RNA sequence: CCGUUAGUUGCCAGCGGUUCGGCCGGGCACUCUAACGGGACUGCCCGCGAAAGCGGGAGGAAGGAGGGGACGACGUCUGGUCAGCAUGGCCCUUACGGCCUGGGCGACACACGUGCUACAAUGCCCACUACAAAGCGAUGCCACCCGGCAACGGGGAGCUAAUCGCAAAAAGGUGGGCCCAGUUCGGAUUGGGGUCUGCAACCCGACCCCAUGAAGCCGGAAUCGCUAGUAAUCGCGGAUCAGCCAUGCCGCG
């Protein structure tokens, strides 16, 4: 990215809820370009949110994400000596990136053997605001506060 | 009585034939959902109709040959679209906005010598 | 129904050479079913550019056999006139059949 | 590994069969380590070349079916 | 998988046919 | 050796297993393309001169 | 329940379970289950003494096994020592035997990695 | 992307006969095949600019180098190669030439590079299930029959190959199995029985089937690739070639 700003690569709407945010999340689930298998999972998992709660999946989903977005984080920095964990505001596009990435990672950290379940129970534990994703997210936010002393370096 | 647009996408070509009235869709002497059997995306190929409002009110007979499945899904998506603009020059100004009308040039880029794979380059060790 | 195959490394002197073979058969016979282009058999060579040890970097060489075909429905000698010797093919070949 | 003969060399057999009319010679030295040890023509000792020299190998019943090369190893300290 | 002579996958990878992947 | 050798590779020998190829100009054992009796080098050479017909600069 | 040698497979499917025998693989057990007509899906847990003997009988009989097999292998090799063929001194040395490289690899046949010094 | 030329590969697209296989009359529409052309120019609109141009909008398959190649200045590294070849010098000329048989280049206490196959459930097995995209084949590909669990062996039709064959695409989809285990993960190693090519497979071939089933539960310090049909992942072919140590390379999708 020396020359340009690079356009936020624009995604193909969810062919089932009509949501760009969803595809995004489907892609993060995908391994070796098995997009089919990936969507099976996301949807089978929306299945497991009715079969377990009254409310709409797209709604659990939107919400789980919201809780997992970090607002500040430490970026590393050169100074005369060694380095400084410099807290700074996290841009909206990145917030999204991190949320989804974290949901999928946290999901596959869970104990249940079948993927759609893991995805679901994590989605569920998130909107309630107590998944291991929201954990490794308060860890960031807290750590940006620990370092509040160095917030006079933000570019 | 009859309508045609040709779709292509990456080795795969679509023969589309629209007929008035109905809702059912043959592909290669097979039901749609029989050809694209639980392949999550297929429901996309007919999105050109959904956008015009002819959601149902057309029959479609289809040949489709070339390389592979998910391309064919898009191939059709062009056929359908092209075929129905040739049943209405007025079907431009709504299909073009979502551009179901652009061929989409993106092919397998070609394997280059010295690389492993077109871009993927071999493994440097330095020391 | 005389039907003839024509091979050639040279795509120009076939569509050229074996499509005078359509004048001298509509002008001197009767009905022709025009030149038909058979797909090509492309033999490729991959050669390491240097005499010694330069395994990445080579150069690509092809040898491309083009294939053209001609049908006429006229086994008379009002045709076999030009169509035996009346030449302009120099790196070409002929398959003769019915 | 074949089953249509036991691809054993002429020059050797000729020399064994012709030793098989009262023949008990040690002086027997081959170069065909490629030849199969053949059903029962045992008792003898054959000097097999390893590339550098021939080797006094005594031949027993338990060791038929094997090639001669198997008993004359070609490289040093192994 | 690909390493196992006695799987379908094994056979494919290896080029071969046999008991574990026949020729129809 | 490469003479008593360029020569020996011409005799039809006892057992056909021993039958090898050899670049017919650049008198040479390895990478001998069979359609040309030509060593990959003494080959890229003639190709460049056009002394092998139809043979060309490939590009796609 | 103790089929072969001194063998108690358990609680898993019999095709899998038969496996736990030395000299029985996925193939020889696919076989036994047909030549004695036992549904191979059945859990060992649940199957007739009838069946368990039909099995005992077929297996303990049809082929050499689990220990006195083991003994034949031990003694096939000590005989490969004979007067002493190649593959012999090779077993003697503990190095590969199906003619593979030794420069790199051969780790399975050699005790982990006995590292040394050298160079400049 | 579109057009013209062209009908043993395209089809009820349209109609008729179909033993219901485009197979048969029949047609090239379409798909394709391959030749030739057209098309994109900052040409058009708005805004900024002195200009070049920049940002945006139109229409268009494509828009500002649309995407990938071929193509490597003057020179640099006394770079590489005398073992491809050519060459000055120098040196051996019953031997530093030549011929053969056998061994070696395949050694193995160690150490590094590049890879392959894994460590599993987004997984593994077995079944059923055309989505085809380059190339090769008449001392060849080998359909199809029969023998064999199979490698393969009989037979044996077709193709000088858009006609016949390699050819199964694999990942996928459907069904069923395994249930978290060093396992139905993984297939190293070793025992055994065979197949093939070849004068010949000990050192030193690949392949099939039975047994044997190793380390490996995702890797320290380090460190490599890639910016889109790319990376990742799945197969397919070819060159050399009797066979093959190809997991390599060059290519296809």
Curated annotation (Swiss-Prot), chain A:
Any one of the GO CC terms: small ribosomal subunit
Pfam families registered for this protein in UniProt: Ribosomal_S7
Disulfide cysteine pairs (residue numbers): none
UniProt-listed Gene3D superfamilies: Ribosomal protein S7 domain
GO molecular function, one term: structural constituent of ribosome
Signal sequence coordinates: none
PROSITE patterns per record: RIBOSOMAL_S7
InterPro entries for this protein: Ribosomal_uS7 (IPR000235), Ribosomal_uS7_bac/org-type (IPR005717), Ribosomal_uS7_CS (IPR020606), Ribosomal_uS7_dom (IPR023798), Ribosomal_uS7_dom_sf (IPR036823)
Highest taxon in the source lineage: Bacteria
A biological process term (GO) from this entry: translation
Keywords, alphabetical: Ribonucleoprotein, Ribosomal protein, RNA-binding, rRNA-binding, tRNA-binding
Family that this chain belongs to: Belongs to the universal ribosomal protein uS7 family.
Subunit structure, as described in the record: Part of the 30S ribosomal subunit. Contacts proteins S9 and S11. Binds to the C-terminus of IF3 and to the C-terminus of Era.
Family annotation (HAMAP family): Ribosomal_uS7_B
Function: One of the primary rRNA binding proteins, it binds directly to 3'-end of the 16S rRNA where it nucleates assembly of the head domain of the 30S subunit. Is located at the subunit interface close to the decoding center. Binds mRNA and the E site tRNA blocking its exit path in the ribosome. This blockage implies that this section of the ribosome must be able to move to release the deacetylated tRNA.
Name of this protein: Small ribosomal subunit protein uS7
Chain's gene name: rpsG
From Swiss-Prot, chain C:
PROSITE patterns: RIBOSOMAL_S10 (PS00361)
Entry's Gene Ontology molecular function annotations: rRNA binding; structural constituent of ribosome; tRNA binding
Keywords, ordered alphabetically: Ribonucleoprotein, Ribosomal protein, RNA-binding, rRNA-binding
A Gene Ontology cellular-component term: ribonucleoprotein complex
InterPro entries, sorted: Ribosomal_uS10, Ribosomal_uS10_CS, Ribosomal_uS10_dom, Ribosomal_uS10_dom_sf
UniProt record similarity statement: Belongs to the universal ribosomal protein uS10 family.
Subunit-structure text: Part of the 30S ribosomal subunit. Forms a tight complex with proteins S3 and S14. Also contacts protein S9.
Protein name (record): Small ribosomal subunit protein uS10
Organism of derivation: Thermus thermophilus (strain ATCC 27634 / DSM 579 / HB8)
Swiss-Prot record, chain D:
Any single Gene Ontology cellular-component annotation: small ribosomal subunit
Keyword terms: Ribonucleoprotein, Ribosomal protein, RNA-binding, rRNA-binding
UniProt keyword annotation of DNA-binding present: no
Biological process according to GO: ribosomal small subunit assembly; translation
Gene Ontology terms, MF aspect: rRNA binding; structural constituent of ribosome
Task of the protein: Located at the top of the head of the 30S subunit, extending towards the 50S subunit, which it may contact in the 70S complex. Contacts several RNA helices of the 16S rRNA.
Family the UniProt entry places it in: Belongs to the universal ribosomal protein uS19 family.
Record note on quaternary structure: Part of the 30S ribosomal subunit. Forms a loose dimer with protein S13.
Protein name: Small ribosomal subunit protein uS19
Shown stretch of the complete protein: 4 to 81 of 93
UniProtKB/Swiss-Prot annotation, chain E:
Keyword list, A-Z: Ribonucleoprotein, Ribosomal protein, RNA-binding, rRNA-binding
GO cellular component, as recorded: ribonucleoprotein complex; ribosome
Residue ranges with Basic residues bias: 1-12
Nucleus listed as a keyword: no
Domain of life where this protein originates: Bacteria
InterPro entries registered for this protein in UniProt: Ribosomal_bTHX, Ribosomal_bTHX/bTHXc/bTHXm
Region spans: Disordered: 1-24
Family: Belongs to the bacterial ribosomal protein bTHX family.
Function, as annotated: Binds at the top of the head of the 30S subunit. It stabilizes a number of different RNA elements and thus is important for subunit structure.
Assembly, per entry: Part of the 30S ribosomal subunit.
NCBIfam families hit by this protein: PRK14753.1, ribo_THX
Record's protein name: Small ribosomal subunit protein bTHX
Organism annotation: Thermus thermophilus (strain ATCC 27634 / DSM 579 / HB8)
